[PDB]
Amino acid sequence: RPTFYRQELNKTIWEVPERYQNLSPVGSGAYGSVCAAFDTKTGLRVAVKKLSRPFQSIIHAKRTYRELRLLKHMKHENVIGLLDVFTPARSLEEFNDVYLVTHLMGADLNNIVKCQKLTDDHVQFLIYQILRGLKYIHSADIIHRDLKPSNLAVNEDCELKILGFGLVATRWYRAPEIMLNWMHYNQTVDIWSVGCIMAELLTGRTLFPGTDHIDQLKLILRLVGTPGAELLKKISSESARNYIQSLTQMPKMNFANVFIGANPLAVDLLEKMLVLDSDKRITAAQALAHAYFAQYHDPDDEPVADPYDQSFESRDLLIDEWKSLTYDEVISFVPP
Numbered sequence: 474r475p476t477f478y479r480q481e482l483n484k485t486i487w488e489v490p491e492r493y494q495n496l497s498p499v500g501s502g503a504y505g506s507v508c509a510a511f512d513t514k515t516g517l518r519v520a521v522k523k524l525s526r527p528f529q530s531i532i533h534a535k536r537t538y539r540e541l542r543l544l545k546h547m548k549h550e551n552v553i554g555l556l557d558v559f560t561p562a563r564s565l566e567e568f569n570d571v572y573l574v575t576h577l578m579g580a581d582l583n584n585i586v587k588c589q590k591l592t593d594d595h596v597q598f599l600i601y602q603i604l605r606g607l608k609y610i611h612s613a614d615i616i617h618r619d620l621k622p623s624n625l626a627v628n629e630d631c632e633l634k635i636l637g638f639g640l641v642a643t644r645w646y647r648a649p650e651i652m653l654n655w656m657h658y659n660q661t662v663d664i665w666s667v668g669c670i671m672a673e674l675l676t677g678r679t680l681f682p683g684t685d686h687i688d689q690l691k692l693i694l695r696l697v698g699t700p701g702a703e704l705l706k707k708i709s710s711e712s713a714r715n716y717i718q719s720l721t722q723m724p725k726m727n728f729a730n731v732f733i734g735a736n737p738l739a740v741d742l743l744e745k746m747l748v749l750d751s752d753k754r755i756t757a758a759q760a761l762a763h764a765y766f767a768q769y770h771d772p773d774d775e776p777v778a779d780p781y782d783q784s785f786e787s788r789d790l791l792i793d794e795w796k797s798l799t800y801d802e803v804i805s806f807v808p809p
């Protein structure tokens with residue numbers, strides 16, 4: 474066991490191993506608060522997140538366990554993973570606080586889009602890394618469901634990691650079937666989001682800046698056109714059908730025109746991502762093999778995940794059970 478020291482940072486007591494020096498608040502945090510720290514073992518600056526009421530309720534407790542399970546599993550260059558996890562608690566009886574340690578990235582993609590005029594090469598590299606992480610995430614049977622610029626961490630090298638918890642958002646990036654509810658969806662909900670992100674990096678404009686869920690659907694249809702018969706048949710909802718069909722039939726736009734000036738290989742890929750029919754959307758694995766990424770794609774360096782046990786997602790457990798399982802995950806942790 475490490476020696477711990479305590480320090481008040483913005484009205485809470487942080488208690489961390491002496492390994493972690495010079496804690497400096499960098500943001501928050503739905504969910505938690507994050508400091509930058511100097512890792513004396515490695516000589517690298519890291520992110521330390523103190524969780525924030527991790528066992529408040531059953532929902533918090535399960536979210537907490539999910540953090541430990543996800544982050545201990547994620548082992549990929551373009552996906553957030555765990556450098557360390559600790560608690561000052563000796564024994565389960567005392568177990569109340571959880572700290573996560575991960576790479577300190579310094580900026581998110583929203584910061585980059587708003588400041589920098591990105592070249593085509595930047596868009597190639599950035600989207601390539603997202604798709605590479607996403608291939609890995611999807612191979613573990615995980616759907617992100619909230620891919621957006623603020624959930625994408627980027628360093629000065631333009632290296633990128635996908636995160637689940639941010640610090641533009643969120644309905645702008647959301648697949649149409651999610652806002653129709655549907656239930657009940659596939660992995661390509663994430664591919665829709667990638668298309669929205671990619672479009673935005675190319676043009677410097679939000680592709681579908683809806684004011685609400687209903688405006689969002691309008692804007693999507695403007696671009697992609699009214700669904701054909703084979704798609705309209707699948708919509709159970711009468712009011713969704715009336716809304717869709719009452720929009721005075723929209724012709725699919727010429728993506729060539731909407732994205733004029735863009736690399737035509739970028740446009741071709743966007744057409745394959747931003748398809749209404751989620752069955753017909755390109756997968757992450759297929760997208761990596763698209764010609765747009767010819768300069769980056771290496772089929773021998775786009776790995777998949779070890780199988781991931783998320784049967785826990787099924788369970789309705791008590792707080793102390795989630796807590797005890799989380800505690801077990803903290804104790805069994807082996808660093809990279």
Ligand SMILES: Cn1nc(C(C)(C)C)cc1NC(=O)Nc1ccc(Cl)cc1
Pocket residue numbers: 507520521522540543547552553573575610615616617635636637638639640
């Ligand atoms: C909820 N969640 N889902 C994922 C994916 C799907 C990307 C594995 C990752 C996460 N969780 C996080 O992104 N958690 C997290 C922890 C510490 C910091 Cl400093 C920032 C973020």
Ligand SMILES: CCCCCCCCO[C@@H]1O[C@H](CO)[C@@H](O)[C@H](O)[C@H]1O
Pocket residue numbers: 649650655657658659690691693694700704707717749750751752
């Ligand atoms: C803007 C409103 C247009 C409606 C979008 C149509 C969505 C089509 O995507 C649908 O997704 C479902 C859930 O994964 C699947 O069960 C269907 O097979 C698939 O066709």
